[PDB]
Short mmCIF file of C-alpha atoms in Angstrom, two decimals:
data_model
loop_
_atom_site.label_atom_id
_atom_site.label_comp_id
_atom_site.label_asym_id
_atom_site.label_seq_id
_atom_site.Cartn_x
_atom_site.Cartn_y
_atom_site.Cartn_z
CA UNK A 1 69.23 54.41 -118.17
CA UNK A 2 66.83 51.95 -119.68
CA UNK A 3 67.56 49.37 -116.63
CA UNK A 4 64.18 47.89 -114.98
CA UNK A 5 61.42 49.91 -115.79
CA UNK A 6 57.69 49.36 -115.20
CA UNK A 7 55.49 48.71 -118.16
CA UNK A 8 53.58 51.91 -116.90
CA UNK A 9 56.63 54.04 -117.70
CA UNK A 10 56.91 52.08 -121.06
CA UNK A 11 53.93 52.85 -122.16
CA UNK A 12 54.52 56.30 -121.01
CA UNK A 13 57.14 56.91 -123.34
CA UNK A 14 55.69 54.73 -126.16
CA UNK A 15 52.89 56.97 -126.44
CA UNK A 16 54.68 60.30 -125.96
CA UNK A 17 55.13 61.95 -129.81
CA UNK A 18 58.60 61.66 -129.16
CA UNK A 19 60.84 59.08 -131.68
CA UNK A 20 63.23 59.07 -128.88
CA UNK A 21 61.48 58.67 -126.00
CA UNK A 22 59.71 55.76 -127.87
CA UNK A 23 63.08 54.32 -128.85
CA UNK A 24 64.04 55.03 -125.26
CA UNK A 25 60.87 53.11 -124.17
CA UNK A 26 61.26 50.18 -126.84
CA UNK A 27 64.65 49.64 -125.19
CA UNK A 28 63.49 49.20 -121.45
CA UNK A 29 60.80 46.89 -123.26
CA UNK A 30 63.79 45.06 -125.04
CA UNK A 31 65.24 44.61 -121.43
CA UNK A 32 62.44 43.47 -119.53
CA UNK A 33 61.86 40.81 -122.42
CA UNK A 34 65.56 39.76 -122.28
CA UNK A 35 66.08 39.07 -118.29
CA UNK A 36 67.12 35.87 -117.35
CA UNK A 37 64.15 35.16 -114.86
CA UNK A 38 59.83 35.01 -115.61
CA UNK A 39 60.14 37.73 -118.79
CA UNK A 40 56.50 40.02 -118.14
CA UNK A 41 55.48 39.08 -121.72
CA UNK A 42 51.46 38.72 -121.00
CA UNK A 43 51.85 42.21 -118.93
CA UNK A 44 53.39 43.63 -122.16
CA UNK A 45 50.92 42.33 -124.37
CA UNK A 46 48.10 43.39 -122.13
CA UNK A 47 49.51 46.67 -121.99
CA UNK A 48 48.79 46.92 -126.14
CA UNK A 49 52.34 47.28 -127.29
CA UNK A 50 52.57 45.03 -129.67
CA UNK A 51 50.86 47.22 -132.34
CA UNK A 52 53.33 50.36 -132.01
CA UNK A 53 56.42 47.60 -131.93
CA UNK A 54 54.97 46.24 -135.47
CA UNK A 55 54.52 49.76 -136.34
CA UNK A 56 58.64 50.44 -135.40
CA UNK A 57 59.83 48.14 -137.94
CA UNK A 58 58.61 49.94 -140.64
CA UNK A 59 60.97 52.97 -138.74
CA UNK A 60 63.41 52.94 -141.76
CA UNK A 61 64.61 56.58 -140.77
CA UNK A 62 65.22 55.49 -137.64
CA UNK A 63 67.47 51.76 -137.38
CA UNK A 64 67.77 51.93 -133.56
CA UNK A 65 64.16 51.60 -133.10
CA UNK A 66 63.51 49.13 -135.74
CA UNK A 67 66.34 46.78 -133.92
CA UNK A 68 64.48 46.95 -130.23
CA UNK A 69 61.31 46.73 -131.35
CA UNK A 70 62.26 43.37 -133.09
CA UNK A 71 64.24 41.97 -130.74
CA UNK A 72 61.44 42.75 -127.88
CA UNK A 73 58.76 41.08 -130.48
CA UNK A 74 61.10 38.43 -130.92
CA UNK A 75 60.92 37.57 -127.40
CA UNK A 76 57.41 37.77 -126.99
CA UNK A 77 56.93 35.13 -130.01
CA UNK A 78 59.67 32.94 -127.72
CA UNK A 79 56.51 32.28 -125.60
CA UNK A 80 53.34 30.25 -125.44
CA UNK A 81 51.20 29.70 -128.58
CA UNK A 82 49.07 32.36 -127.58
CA UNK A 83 51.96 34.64 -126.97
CA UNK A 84 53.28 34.06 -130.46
CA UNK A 85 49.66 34.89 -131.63
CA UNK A 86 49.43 37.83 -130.51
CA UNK A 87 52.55 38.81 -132.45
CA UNK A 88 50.94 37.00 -135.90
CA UNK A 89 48.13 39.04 -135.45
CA UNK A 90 49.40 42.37 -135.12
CA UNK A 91 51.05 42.27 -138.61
CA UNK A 92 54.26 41.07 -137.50
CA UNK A 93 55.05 38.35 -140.38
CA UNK A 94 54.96 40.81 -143.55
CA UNK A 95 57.06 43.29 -141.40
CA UNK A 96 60.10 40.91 -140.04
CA UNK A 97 60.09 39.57 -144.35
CA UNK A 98 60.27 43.47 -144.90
CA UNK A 99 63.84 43.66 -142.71
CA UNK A 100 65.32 40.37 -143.98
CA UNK A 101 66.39 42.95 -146.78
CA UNK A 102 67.73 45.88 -144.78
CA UNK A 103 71.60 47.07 -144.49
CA UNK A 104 72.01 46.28 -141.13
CA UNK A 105 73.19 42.96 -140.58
CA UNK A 106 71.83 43.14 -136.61
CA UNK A 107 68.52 43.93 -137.99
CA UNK A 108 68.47 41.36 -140.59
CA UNK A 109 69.54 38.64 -138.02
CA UNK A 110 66.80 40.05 -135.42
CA UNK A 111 64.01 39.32 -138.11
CA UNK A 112 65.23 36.17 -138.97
CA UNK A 113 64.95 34.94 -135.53
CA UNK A 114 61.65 36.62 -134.73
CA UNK A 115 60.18 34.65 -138.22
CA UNK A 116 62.44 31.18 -136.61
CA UNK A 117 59.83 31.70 -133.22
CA UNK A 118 57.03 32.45 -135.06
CA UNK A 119 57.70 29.37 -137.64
CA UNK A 120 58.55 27.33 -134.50
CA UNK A 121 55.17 26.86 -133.13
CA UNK A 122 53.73 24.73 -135.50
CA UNK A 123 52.27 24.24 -139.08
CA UNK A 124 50.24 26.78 -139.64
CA UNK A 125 52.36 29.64 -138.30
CA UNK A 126 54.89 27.65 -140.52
CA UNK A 127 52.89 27.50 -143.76
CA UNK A 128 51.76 31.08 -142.78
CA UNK A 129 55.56 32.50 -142.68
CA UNK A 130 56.02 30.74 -146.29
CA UNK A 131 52.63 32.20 -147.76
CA UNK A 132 54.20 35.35 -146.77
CA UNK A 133 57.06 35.13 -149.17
CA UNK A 134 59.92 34.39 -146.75
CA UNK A 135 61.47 31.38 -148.30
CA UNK A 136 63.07 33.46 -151.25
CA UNK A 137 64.79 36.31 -148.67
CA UNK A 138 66.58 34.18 -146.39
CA UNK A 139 67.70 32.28 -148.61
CA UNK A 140 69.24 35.30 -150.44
CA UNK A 141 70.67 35.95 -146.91
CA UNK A 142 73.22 32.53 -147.80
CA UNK A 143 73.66 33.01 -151.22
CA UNK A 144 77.32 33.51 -151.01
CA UNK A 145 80.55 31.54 -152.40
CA UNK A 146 82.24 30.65 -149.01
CA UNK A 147 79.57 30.75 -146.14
CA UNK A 148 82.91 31.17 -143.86
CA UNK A 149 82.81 34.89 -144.99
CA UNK A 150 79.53 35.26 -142.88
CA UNK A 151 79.16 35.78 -138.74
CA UNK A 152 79.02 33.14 -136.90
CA UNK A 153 75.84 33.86 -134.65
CA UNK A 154 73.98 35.17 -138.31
CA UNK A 155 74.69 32.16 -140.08
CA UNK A 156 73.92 29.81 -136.84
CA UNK A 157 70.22 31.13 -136.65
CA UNK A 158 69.48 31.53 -140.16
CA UNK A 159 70.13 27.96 -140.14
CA UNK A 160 68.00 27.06 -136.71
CA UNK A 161 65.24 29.40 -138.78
CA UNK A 162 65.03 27.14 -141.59
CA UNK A 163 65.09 24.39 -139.66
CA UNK A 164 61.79 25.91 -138.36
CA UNK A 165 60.39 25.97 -141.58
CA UNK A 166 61.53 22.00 -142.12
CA UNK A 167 59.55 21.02 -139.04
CA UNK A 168 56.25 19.59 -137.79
CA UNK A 169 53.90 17.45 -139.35
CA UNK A 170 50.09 17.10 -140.17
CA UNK A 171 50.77 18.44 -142.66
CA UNK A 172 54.53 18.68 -143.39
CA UNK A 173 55.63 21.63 -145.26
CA UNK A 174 54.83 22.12 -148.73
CA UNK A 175 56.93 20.03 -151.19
CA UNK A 176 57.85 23.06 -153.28
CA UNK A 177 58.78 24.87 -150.36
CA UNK A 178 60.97 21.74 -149.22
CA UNK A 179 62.64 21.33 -152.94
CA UNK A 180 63.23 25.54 -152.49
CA UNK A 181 64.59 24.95 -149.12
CA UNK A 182 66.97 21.44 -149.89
CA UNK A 183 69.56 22.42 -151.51
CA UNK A 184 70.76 25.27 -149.62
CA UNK A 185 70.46 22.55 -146.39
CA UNK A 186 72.81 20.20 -148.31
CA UNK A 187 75.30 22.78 -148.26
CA UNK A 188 74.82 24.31 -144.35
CA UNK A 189 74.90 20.07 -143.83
CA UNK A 190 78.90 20.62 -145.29
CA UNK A 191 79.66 23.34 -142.92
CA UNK A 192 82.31 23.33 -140.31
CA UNK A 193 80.24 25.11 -137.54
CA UNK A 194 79.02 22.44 -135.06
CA UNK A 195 75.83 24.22 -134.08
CA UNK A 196 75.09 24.61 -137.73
CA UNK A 197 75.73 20.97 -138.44
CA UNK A 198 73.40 20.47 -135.48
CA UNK A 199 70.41 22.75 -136.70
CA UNK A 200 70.79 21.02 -140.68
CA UNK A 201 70.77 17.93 -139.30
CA UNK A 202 67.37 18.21 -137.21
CA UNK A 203 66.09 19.81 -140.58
CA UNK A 204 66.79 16.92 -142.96
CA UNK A 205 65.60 14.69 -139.49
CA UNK A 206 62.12 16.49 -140.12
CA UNK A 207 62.29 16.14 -143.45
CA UNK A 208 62.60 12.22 -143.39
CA UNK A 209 60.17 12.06 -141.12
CA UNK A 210 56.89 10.99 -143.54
CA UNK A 211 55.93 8.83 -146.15
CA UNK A 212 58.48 7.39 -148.80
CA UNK A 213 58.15 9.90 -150.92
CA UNK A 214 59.34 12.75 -148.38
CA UNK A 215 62.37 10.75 -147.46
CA UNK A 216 62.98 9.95 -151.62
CA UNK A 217 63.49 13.68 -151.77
CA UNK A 218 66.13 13.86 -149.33
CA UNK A 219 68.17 11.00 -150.27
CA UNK A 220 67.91 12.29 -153.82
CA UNK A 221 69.82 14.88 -153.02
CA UNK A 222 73.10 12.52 -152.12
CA UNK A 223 73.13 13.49 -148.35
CA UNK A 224 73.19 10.15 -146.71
CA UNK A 225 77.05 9.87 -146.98
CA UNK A 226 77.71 13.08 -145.17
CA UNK A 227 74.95 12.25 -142.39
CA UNK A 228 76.90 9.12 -142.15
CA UNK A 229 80.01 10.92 -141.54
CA UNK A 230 78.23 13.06 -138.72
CA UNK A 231 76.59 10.01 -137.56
CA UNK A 232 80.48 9.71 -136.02
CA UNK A 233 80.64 12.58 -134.77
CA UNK A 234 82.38 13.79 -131.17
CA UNK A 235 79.58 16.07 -130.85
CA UNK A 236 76.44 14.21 -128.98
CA UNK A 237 74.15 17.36 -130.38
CA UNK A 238 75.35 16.32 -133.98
CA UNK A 239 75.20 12.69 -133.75
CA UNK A 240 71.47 12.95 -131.95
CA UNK A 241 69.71 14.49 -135.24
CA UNK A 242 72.12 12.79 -137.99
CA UNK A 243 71.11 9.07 -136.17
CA UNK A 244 67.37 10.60 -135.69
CA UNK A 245 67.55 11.39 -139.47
CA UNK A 246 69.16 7.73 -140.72
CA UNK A 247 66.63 5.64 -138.27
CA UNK A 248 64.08 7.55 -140.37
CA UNK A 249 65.70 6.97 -144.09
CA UNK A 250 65.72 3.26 -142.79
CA UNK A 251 61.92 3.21 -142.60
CA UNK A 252 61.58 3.95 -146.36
CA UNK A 253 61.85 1.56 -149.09
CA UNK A 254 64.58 -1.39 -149.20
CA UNK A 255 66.62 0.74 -151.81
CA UNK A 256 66.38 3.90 -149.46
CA UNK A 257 67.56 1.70 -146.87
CA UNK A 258 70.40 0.48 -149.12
CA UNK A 259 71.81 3.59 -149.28
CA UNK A 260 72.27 3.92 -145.86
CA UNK A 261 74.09 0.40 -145.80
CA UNK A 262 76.36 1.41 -148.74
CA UNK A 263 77.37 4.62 -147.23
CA UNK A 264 78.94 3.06 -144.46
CA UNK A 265 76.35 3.35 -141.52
CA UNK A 266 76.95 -0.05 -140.26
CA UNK A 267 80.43 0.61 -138.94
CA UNK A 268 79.60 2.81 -136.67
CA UNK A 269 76.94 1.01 -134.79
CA UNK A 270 79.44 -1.16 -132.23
CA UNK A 271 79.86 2.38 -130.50
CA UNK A 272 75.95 3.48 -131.16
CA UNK A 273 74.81 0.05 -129.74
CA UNK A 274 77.13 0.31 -126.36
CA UNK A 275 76.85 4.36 -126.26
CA UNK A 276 76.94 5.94 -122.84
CA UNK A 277 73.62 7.69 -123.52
CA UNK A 278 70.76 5.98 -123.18
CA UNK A 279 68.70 8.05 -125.95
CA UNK A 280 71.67 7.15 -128.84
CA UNK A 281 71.58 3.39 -127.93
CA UNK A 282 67.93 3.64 -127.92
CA UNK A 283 67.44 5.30 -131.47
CA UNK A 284 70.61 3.01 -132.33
CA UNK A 285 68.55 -0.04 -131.75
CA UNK A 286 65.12 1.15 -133.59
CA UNK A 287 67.47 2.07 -136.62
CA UNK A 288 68.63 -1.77 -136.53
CA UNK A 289 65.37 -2.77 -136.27
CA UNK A 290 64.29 -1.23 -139.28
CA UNK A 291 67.61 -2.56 -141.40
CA UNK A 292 66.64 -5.94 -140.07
CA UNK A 293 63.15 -6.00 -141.61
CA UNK A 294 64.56 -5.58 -144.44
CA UNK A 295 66.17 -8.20 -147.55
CA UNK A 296 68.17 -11.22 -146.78
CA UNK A 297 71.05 -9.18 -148.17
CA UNK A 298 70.63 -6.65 -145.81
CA UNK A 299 70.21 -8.84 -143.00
CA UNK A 300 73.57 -10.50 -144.32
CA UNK A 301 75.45 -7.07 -143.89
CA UNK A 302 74.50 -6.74 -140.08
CA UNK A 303 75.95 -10.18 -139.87
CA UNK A 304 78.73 -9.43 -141.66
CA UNK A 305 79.86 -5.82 -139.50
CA UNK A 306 79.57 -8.41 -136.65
CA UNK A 307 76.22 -6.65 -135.22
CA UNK A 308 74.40 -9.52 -134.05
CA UNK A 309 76.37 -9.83 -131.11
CA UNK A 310 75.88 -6.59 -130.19
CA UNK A 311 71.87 -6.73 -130.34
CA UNK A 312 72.62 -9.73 -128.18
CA UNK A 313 74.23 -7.70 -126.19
CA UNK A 314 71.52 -4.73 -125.78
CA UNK A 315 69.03 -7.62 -125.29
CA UNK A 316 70.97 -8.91 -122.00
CA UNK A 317 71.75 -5.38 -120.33
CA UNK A 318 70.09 -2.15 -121.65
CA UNK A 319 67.52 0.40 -120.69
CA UNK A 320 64.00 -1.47 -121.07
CA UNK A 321 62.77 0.81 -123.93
CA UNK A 322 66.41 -0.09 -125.60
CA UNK A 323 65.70 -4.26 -125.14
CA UNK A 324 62.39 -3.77 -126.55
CA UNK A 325 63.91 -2.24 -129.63
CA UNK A 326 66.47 -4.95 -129.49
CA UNK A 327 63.38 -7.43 -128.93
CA UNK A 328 61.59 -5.92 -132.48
CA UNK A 329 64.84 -5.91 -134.50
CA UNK A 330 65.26 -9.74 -133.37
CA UNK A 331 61.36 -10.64 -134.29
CA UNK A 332 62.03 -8.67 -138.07
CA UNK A 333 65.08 -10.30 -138.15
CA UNK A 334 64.24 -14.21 -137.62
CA UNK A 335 60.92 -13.32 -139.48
CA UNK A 336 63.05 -12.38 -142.94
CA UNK A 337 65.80 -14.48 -142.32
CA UNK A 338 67.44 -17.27 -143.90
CA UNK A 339 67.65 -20.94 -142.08
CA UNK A 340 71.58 -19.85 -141.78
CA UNK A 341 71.12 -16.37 -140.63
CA UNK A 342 68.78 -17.77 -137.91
CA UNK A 343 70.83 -20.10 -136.91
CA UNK A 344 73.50 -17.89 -136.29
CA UNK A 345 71.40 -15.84 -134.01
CA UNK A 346 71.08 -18.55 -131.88
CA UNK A 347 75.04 -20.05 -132.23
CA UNK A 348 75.19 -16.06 -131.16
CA UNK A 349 73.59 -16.46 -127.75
CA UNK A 350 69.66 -15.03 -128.28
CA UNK A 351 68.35 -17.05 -126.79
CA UNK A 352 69.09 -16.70 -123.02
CA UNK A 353 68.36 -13.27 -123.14
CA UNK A 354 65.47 -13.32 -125.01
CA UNK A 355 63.84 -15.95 -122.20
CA UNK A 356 64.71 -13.02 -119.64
CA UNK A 357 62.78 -10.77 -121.03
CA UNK A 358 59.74 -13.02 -120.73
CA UNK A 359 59.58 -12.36 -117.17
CA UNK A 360 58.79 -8.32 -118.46
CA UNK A 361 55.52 -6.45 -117.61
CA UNK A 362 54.67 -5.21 -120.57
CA UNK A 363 52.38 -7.36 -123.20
CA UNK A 364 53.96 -6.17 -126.51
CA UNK A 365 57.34 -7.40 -125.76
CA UNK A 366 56.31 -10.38 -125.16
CA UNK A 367 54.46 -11.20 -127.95
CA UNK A 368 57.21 -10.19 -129.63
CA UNK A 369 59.86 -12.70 -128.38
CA UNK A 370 57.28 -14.85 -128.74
CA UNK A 371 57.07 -14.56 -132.34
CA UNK A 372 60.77 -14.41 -132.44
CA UNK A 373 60.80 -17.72 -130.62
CA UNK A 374 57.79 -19.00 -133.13
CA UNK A 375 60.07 -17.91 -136.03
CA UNK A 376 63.56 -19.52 -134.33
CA UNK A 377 61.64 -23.36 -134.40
CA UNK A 378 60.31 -22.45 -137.75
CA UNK A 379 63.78 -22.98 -138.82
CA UNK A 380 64.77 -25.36 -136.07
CA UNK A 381 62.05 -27.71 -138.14
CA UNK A 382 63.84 -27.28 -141.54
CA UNK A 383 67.13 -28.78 -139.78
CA UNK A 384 64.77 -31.24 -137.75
CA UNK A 385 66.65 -30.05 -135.27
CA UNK A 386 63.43 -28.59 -132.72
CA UNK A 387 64.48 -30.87 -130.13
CA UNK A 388 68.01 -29.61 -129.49
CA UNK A 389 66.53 -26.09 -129.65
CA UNK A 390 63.82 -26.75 -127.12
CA UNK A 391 66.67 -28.14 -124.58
CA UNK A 392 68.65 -24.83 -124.74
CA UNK A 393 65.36 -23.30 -123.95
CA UNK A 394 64.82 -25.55 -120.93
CA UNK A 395 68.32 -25.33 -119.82
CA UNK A 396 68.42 -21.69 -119.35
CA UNK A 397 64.58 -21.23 -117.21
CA UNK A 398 62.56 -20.58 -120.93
CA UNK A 399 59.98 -23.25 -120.18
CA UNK A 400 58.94 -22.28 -117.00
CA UNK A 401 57.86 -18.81 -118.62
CA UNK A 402 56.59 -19.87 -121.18
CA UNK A 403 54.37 -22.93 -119.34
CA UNK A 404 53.24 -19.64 -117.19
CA UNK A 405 52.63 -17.69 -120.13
CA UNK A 406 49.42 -19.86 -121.11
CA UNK A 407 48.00 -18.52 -118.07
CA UNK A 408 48.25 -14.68 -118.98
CA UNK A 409 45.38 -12.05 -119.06
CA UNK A 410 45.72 -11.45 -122.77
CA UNK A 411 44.83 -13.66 -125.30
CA UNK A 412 47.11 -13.54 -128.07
CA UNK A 413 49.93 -14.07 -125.34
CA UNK A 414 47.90 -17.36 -123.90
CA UNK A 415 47.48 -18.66 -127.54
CA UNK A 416 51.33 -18.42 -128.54
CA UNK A 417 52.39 -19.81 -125.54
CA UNK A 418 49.98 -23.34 -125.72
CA UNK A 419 50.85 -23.54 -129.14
CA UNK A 420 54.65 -23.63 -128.65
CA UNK A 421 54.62 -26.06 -125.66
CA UNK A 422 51.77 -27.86 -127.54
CA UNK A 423 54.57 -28.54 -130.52
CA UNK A 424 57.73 -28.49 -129.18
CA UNK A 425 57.76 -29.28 -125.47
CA UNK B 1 64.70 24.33 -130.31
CA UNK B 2 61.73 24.94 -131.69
CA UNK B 3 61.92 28.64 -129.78
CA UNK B 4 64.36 30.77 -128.38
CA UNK B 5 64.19 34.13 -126.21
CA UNK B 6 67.20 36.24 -126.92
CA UNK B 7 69.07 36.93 -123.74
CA UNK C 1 57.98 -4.97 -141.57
CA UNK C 2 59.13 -1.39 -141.11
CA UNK C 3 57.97 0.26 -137.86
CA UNK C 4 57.86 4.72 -138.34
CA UNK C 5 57.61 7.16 -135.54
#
């Protein structure tokens, strides 16, 4: 009935003064926007529907209509930025926070989704959605004893929508919009759904990402326990945004990092640090490189959950963007470290691995392990015990790149190498 | 993620 | 030493 029709004919029955044949109409529109292949959103916009399709949601008298009209506009806000314009500036916003309230639970989810796209595309449209008073309705939508009691698929995307409203930076969302929005997200972060576990998660991951203060506000709320729980999670679309979210607690303060360390994070980094993904054992490996630059304590407890080995271990055989993480969280590591900690880096096996990656193509990495090395003899001095350390580093082909690092095309690489071989070998 | 097209 | 996004 309302299977593959041209826009012409949409129009057509969009401008007929016929509530049916516009609902009729709306619905082809609804189906066009909904196939699987190349959607003919810009033909549909340049066709002027938008306007009559903001002008169906206020249809209260007539539910059908308001339904297809936001699920088509919905679709067209799926699109570019300009796309998702277009639906902005034909009134859309103060219409879809109109239906959050109505009786039908269809509708309400439709709006909710359409305000999740428009949110989506970045700060403005985000800030814009919040100006707009939507904050306050959807979160009525969850204010219920047992969130169980709701649907599934309602539940799952008022949880992706505020999400949206978590998101993007420069700036990030308004602090009294993220206090409204927190504690509703600790409790969606304590449901059983696992795409809803997902979707909090990359919240409270946008959330910590920002200055000290942003992240103070999360952890405030006691959530670093239960993103430590999903940080051991079956589920690689959990574990992604709960390890996203701790790597970026972990670049607060050394008491926000604490937390992290007293919830139990550490344990679960000997499957992080060796997972099969590449992404996890990257982020894995930034997240120790940031508890590593932290106090002599904290160093102590990656020593003590027997982690060291394992950075050794990313350092010998990883992607390259994992051993350069691996590479930073050695340098933090022998720069805060105690003589004993350092030495056990070496009585660990660094340094072999760390000569390897001399022999890299890239110019931060090496000054890096070069700084790492700087810091190792450091301590080596302290135990006048340079000598034995600059035979291991002979033994195992360190020299030689080193001796060939004075003659590198960068001069903070030349300088570090001459003055290592110009004190210890 | 940070839009979806309903299907 | 912390190193953000």
């Amino acid at each position: 009935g309302t299977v593959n029709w041209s826009v012409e004919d949409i129009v057509k029955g969009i401008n007929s003064n016929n509530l049916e044949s516009q609902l009729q109409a709306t619905q082809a529109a609804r189906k066009l926007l909904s196939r699987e292949k190349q959607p003919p959103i810009d033909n549909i916009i340049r066709a002027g529907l938008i306007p009559k399709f903001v002008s169906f949601l206020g249809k209260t008298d007539c539910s059908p209509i308001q339904f297809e009209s936001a699920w088509a506009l919905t679709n067209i806000a799926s699109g570019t930025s300009e796309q998702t314009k277009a639906v902005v500036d034909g009134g859309a916003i103060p219409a879809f926070i109109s239906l959050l309230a109505s009786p039908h639970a269809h509708i309400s989810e439709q709006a909710v989704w359409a305000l999740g796209n428009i949110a989506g595309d970045g700060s403005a449209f985000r800030d814009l959605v919040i100006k707009h008073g939507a904050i306050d309705p959807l979160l009525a939508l969850l204010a219920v004893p047992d969130l169980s009691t709701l649907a599934c698929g309602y539940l799952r995307n008022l949880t992706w929508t505020l999400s949206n409203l978590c998101r993007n930076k420069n700036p990030a969302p308004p602090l009294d919009a993220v206090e409204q929005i927190l504690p509703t997200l600790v409790r969606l972060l304590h449901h059983n759904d696992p795409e809803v576990l997902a979707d909090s998660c990359w919240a409270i991951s946008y959330l910590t990402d920002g200055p000290n203060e942003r992240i103070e506000m999360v952890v405030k709320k006691g959530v670093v326990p239960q993103l430590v729980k999903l940080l051991g999670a079956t589920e690689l679309p959990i574990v992604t945004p709960a390890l996203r979210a701790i790597g970026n607690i972990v670049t607060g303060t050394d008491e926000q990092t604490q937390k992290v360390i007293d919830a139990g994070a550490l344990a679960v980094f000997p499957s992080l640090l060796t997972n099969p993904k590449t992404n996890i054992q990257k982020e894995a490996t930034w997240t120790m490189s940031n508890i590593t630059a932290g106090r002599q304590d904290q160093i102590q407890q990656v020593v003590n959950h027997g982690l060291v080995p394992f950075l050794v271990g990313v350092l010998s055989k990883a992607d390259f963007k994992t051993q350069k993480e691996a590479a930073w969280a050695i340098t933090n590591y022998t720069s805060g470290g105690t003589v004993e900690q350092i030495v056990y880096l070496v009585h660990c096996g660094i340094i072999e691995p760390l000569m390897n990656l001399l022999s890299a193509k890239d110019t931060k990495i090496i000054q890096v392990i070069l700084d790492a090395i700087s810091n190792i003899f450091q301590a080596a001095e302290k135990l006048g015990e340079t000598e034995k350390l600059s035979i291991m580093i002979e033994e195992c082909g360190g020299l030689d790149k080193i001796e060939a690092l004075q003659r590198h095309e960068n001069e903070s690489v030349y300088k570090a190498s001459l003055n290592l071989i110009e004190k210890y070998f | 993620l940070p839009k979806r097209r309903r299907a």
